Amino acid sequence: PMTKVLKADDINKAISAFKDPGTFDYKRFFHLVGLKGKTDAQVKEVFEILDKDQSGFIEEEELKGVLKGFSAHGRDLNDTETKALLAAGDSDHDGKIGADEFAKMVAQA
Ligand SMILES: [Ca+2]
Numbered sequence: 226p227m228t229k230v231l232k233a234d235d236i237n238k239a240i241s242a243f244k245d246p247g248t249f250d251y252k253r254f255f256h257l258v259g260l261k262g263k264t265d266a267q268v269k270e271v272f273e274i275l276d277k278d279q280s281g282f283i284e285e286e287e288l289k290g291v292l293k294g295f296s297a298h299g300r301d302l303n304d305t306e307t308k309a310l311l312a313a314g315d316s317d318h319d320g321k322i323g324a325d326e327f328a329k330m331v332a333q334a
Pocket residue numbers: 276277278279280281282283284287
């Protein structure tokens with residue numbers, strides 16, 4: 226559950242900001258949810274909840290469901306929003322987000 230790391234109200238604030246399709250911005254999202262300023266081990270705890278099938282990577286299918294990892298009231302990301310997350314975070318160009326790529330995205334937000 227994300228409340229092991231993040232405040233319940235910050236999660237709801239961030240879900241509200243992105244309730245409508247096409248609005249996602251990863252930098253604003255990590256600022257609103259309070260993931261900035263957390264330790265490397267807390268960020269990797271969040272990474273592990275988002276990696277639903279426990280493959281060690283957030284594949285595109287799971288990137289689409291990133292907001293639902295924080296709240297069941299969230300919506301799915303559309304394909305333009307999912308591609309923008311790979312454009313910004315997929316450093317080694319293998320088409321998915323690894324743990325240190327995810328930690329980097331949080332660091333640069
Ligand atoms: Ca996975």
